[PDB]
């Protein structure tokens, strides 16, 4: 971290993976359409 | 009230419900307290009910209101209260959240509503109570319009209990021509008719009937009965004796382009004067259908109908009915060759999206207003000369312009400060920048404004403060640059005449003051000049114009008053004493806003915006200008001296009342001009380095400024704890900006000596306060004032001294925590 000392560290903010063995496992929104079931709230849509 | 929020699926009774309650409260046989809790309710439902449902409200009220009689006074106010609500919704390009965007048809309606209530207050007679109630309402539908809405029927005529009045039609001529295109189209007609019959599986039958399903008119035109054939013509040569009315001609010379088979008029296309033409038939359409339900009313006594509203109020699609078939008549006549003339309609159709915008209009406005108030202003001269009994013509135009025009150019230009300051290239605003017209136009209101209200304080009286706070605002929103670059030779004279007149004005104030046309000049100046150049100058340093506005002319009237206030400053009157601030001011901001290093002659050669590298030395003759920039004017010492005579001061020790010259103009004055010439001169961030660039017009360094914040630092010290010091805040004001360039060495060197003292200090009061309430009766009593007077003195001193202490703490803060300090760690202490 670059700027931790400066400002946050001392106020008392932690990193958020201080204390992980690991890599924190990240998500993204891939933009491949997809199938999924009509929610039973669709605003717009509504099967009977 | 509340619970109507959201109501959309009942948007139709919601609106039923709306005019139900509007025409109750125009209310005759109504008391009072009626009308009161009527109106009550209309607010009410008003301010929770969504914008987009209010519409058919205001449509209703843009007919209503612009008659402003006794009715249109709580019309004001619901608008005024609605437009304050939900001026996002109209304005922002995405409109308000949650509630959509405005329509094309709202934004005509609010524009309409807005000219016409303009109007007619325009041409009201003064009456205190509607001018109050009607200058916030068009401020508030003026904030809700965007600046650049084009209306998409605009209309340059501008023609014109609704009485719907159409042209005579009846006592008019049909022409055997017309007569001719008459029949065609009455076959046209019939045609496009019994198609639609064809869709409904109607057939030319014996009789008419619902059941039978066949209508036994629909025939061919041979077998047609001639009786019921003009009876099919009777609305076309109605209509064709109208247009004659209009004087319409038209002339079959020139040629352009049972069984229903009517030929498609789609495909043609219909020009835009063709396309006007259209809605003034549609109109007069409109005009007879509402007089035949105004004769239904009549005979009946009373009622009012629901669409006797006029056609262009009238949205698009209850336009459509009347709109599309005045164009199947219109294309029809061009068809068989009748190509209508325009003459009036045809000349007054130009004009381009700029000059419709609304913005453009309300300047152009303005402008005339301008003029007028030049006019009555001489009258008002004249009169107060001579004749000081009798009553001024233009009262009402007097009223007009101080009660509505100042407050609405106020509020308009605080509200569309960014859009007039966007550019193209660079956009401040949510959306849409004005045009270079609209620029040139906003900078003529400022010239001419300030040309008004010159040497007329007095005149003007309690209006002055309004007029000096609409020169703020319109100086704050003037984009100086690209009127100046590229623009009229009028407008950039105007704006050349004015700072000519303020250096002039502010000359004789300065040899007055050195040593009742002395009294006006006076307070015109320190009431008016002063501040709204201070504001001019400050404006055009904050957006870097100075570059590209402050020269040539510009430039030899910003030396004359930079000068000239200098020159002032020395000398040693109460009336000096008490002007030294706003002459500081405006001597500081002009110093930042100047292009040229006016301490620095020695290096003018390097300055490409400086007048004698611009204009010629054969140039500059024809001008008073001297050969050369050192004798512009000399009284103002070189850099090197001023930073000399402010470290030997500081050092020295002198209190306030021995340098009141320099603290209050010459500190200003040089901490706006040292960072100004920082940047452009030697150890800047070097943009253009790598390619060729010539020689610094500056020597400014940090060192430079270094030195000046530690002459600062040390006059305060040289001045803390003594009885009297106003001039503290507004010396630590100025030198803000200096801190920035501080050395890491002046923590050590000023700052931690500085709050040492101050500490000490306080430590001496506290210990005073305890002494004091350990002591009891009349001995704590009195000796608390003195106390009181310690801590008032020791809080001057902190808020003096602090600003700069902030500014340097969080320029140093990064290198402190990075490596410890032990000098940062005993200001922390202290």
């Known amino acids: ?48 | 009230a509340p619970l109507f929020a959201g109501t959309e699926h009942r948007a139709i009774m919601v609106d039923s419900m709306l005019h139900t309650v509007y025409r109750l409260s125009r209310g005759r046989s109504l008391t009072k307290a009626q009308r009161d809790v009527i109106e009550d309710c209309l607010m009410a439902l008003c301010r929770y009910i969504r914008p987009s449902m209010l519409q058919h409200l205001l449509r209703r009220l843009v007919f209503d209101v612009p008659i402003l009689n006794e009715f249109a006074k709580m019309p004001l106010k619901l608008l005024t209260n609605h437009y304050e609500r939900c001026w996002k919704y109209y304005c922002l390009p995405t409109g308000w959240a949650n509630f959509g965007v405005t329509s094309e048809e709202e934004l005509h309606l609010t524009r309409k509503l807005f000219w016409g209530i303009f109007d007619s207050l325009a041409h009201k007679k003064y009456d205190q109570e509607l001018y109050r109630i009607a200058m916030p309402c068009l401020c508030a539908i003026a904030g809700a319009l965007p600046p650049d809405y084009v209306d998409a029927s605009y209309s340059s005529k501008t023609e014109k209990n609704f009485d719907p009045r159409p042209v005579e039609t009846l006592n008019v001529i049909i022409p055997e021509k017309l007569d001719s295109f008459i029949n065609k189209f009455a076959e046209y007609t019939h045609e496009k008719w019994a198609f639609d019959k064809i869709q409904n599986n109607w057939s030319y039958g014996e009789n008419i009937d619902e059941e039978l399903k066949t209508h036994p008119m629909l025939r061919p035109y041979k077998t047609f009965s001639e009786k019921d054939k003009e009876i099919y013509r009777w609305p076309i040569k109605e209509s064709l004796k109208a247009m004659i009315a209009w004087e319409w001609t038209v002339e079959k010379a020139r040629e352009g382009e049972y069984n229903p088979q009517p030929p498609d008029l789609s495909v043609v296309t219909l020009s835009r004067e063709l396309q006007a033409m259209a809605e003034q038939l549609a109109e007069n359409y409109h005009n007879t259908w509402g007089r035949k339900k105004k004769q239904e009313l009549e005979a009946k006594g009373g009622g009012s109908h629901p669409l006797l509203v006029p056609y262009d109020t009238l949205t698009a699609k209850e336009k459509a009915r009347d709109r599309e078939k005045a164009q199947e008549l219109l294309k029809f006549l061009q068809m068989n060759g009748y190509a209508v003339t325009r003459g009036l309609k045809d000349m007054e159709l130009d004009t381009s999206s700029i000059e419709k915008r609304f913005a453009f209009g309300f300047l152009q406005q303005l402008l005339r207003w301008m003029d007028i108030s030049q006019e009555f202003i001489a009258h008002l001269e004249a009169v107060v000369s001579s004749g000081r009994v009798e009553k001024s013509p233009h009262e009402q135009e007097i009223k007009f312009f101080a009660k509505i025009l100042l407050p609405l150019i106020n509020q308009y230009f605080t509200n569309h400060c960014l859009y007039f300051l966007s550019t193209p290239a660079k956009v401040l605003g949510s959306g849409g920048h004005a045009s270079n017209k609209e620029k040139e136009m906003i900078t003529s209101l400022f010239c001419k404004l300030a040309a008004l209200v010159r040497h007329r304080v007095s005149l003007f009286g309690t209006d002055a403060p309004a007029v000096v706070n609409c020169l703020h605002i319109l100086a704050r929103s003037l984009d100086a640059r690209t009127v100046m670059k590229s623009g009229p030779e009028i407008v950039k004279a105007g704006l050349r005449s004015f700072f000519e007149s303020a250096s002039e004005d502010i000359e004789k104030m300065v040899e007055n003051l050195r040593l009742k046309g002395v009294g006006q000049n006076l307070t015109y100046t320190t009431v008016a000049l002063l501040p709204v150049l201070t504001t001019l100058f400050q404006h055009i340093a904050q957006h870097q114009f100075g570059d590209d506005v402050i020269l040539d002319d510009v430039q030899v009237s910003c030396y004359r008053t930079l000068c000239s206030i200098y020159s002032l400053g020395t000398t040693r009157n109460p009336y000096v004493e008490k002007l030294r601030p706003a002459l500081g001011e405006c001597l500081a901001r002009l110093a930042a806003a100047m292009p040229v290093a006016f301490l620095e002659p020695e290096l003018n050669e390097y300055n490409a915006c400086s007048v004698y590298t611009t204009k010629s030395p054969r140039e500059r003759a024809i001008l008073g200008l001297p050969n050369s920039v050192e004798e512009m004017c000399p009284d103002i010492p070189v850099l090197e001296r001023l930073m000399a005579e402010i470290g030997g001061l500081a050092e020295s020790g002198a209190r306030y009342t021995e340098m009141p010259h320099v603290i209050e103009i010459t500190l200003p004055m040089l901490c706006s001009y040292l960072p100004r010439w920082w940047e452009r001169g030697p150890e800047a961030p070097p943009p253009a380095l790598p390619a060729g660039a010539p020689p610094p017009c500056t020597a400014v360094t940090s060192d430079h400024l270094n030195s000046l914040l530690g002459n600062i630092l040390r006059i305060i010290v040289n001045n803390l704890g003594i009885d009297e010091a106003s001039w503290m805040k507004r010396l630590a004001v100025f030198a803000q900006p200096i801190v920035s360039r501080a050395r890491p060495e002046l923590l050590r060197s000023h700052f931690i000596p500085t709050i040492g003292r101050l500490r000490k200090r306080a430590g001496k009061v506290v210990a005073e306060e305890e002494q004091l309430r350990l002591e009891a009766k009349a001995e704590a009593e009195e000796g608390e004032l003195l106390v009181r007077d310690e801590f008032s003195v020791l809080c001057r001193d902190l808020y003096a001294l602090y600003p700069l202490l902030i500014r340097y703490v969080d320029n140093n803060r990064a290198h402190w925590l990075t490596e410890p300090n032990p000098n940062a760690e005993e200001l922390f202490r202290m």
């Open chain 1, 1 to 48: 971290l670059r700027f931790f000392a400066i400002c946050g560290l001392q106020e008392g903010f932690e990193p958020f993976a201080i204390n992980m063995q690991r890599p924190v496992t990240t998500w993204f929104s891939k933009s491949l359409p997809q199938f999924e079931p009509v929610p039973l709230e669709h605003p717009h849509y509504e099967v009977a």
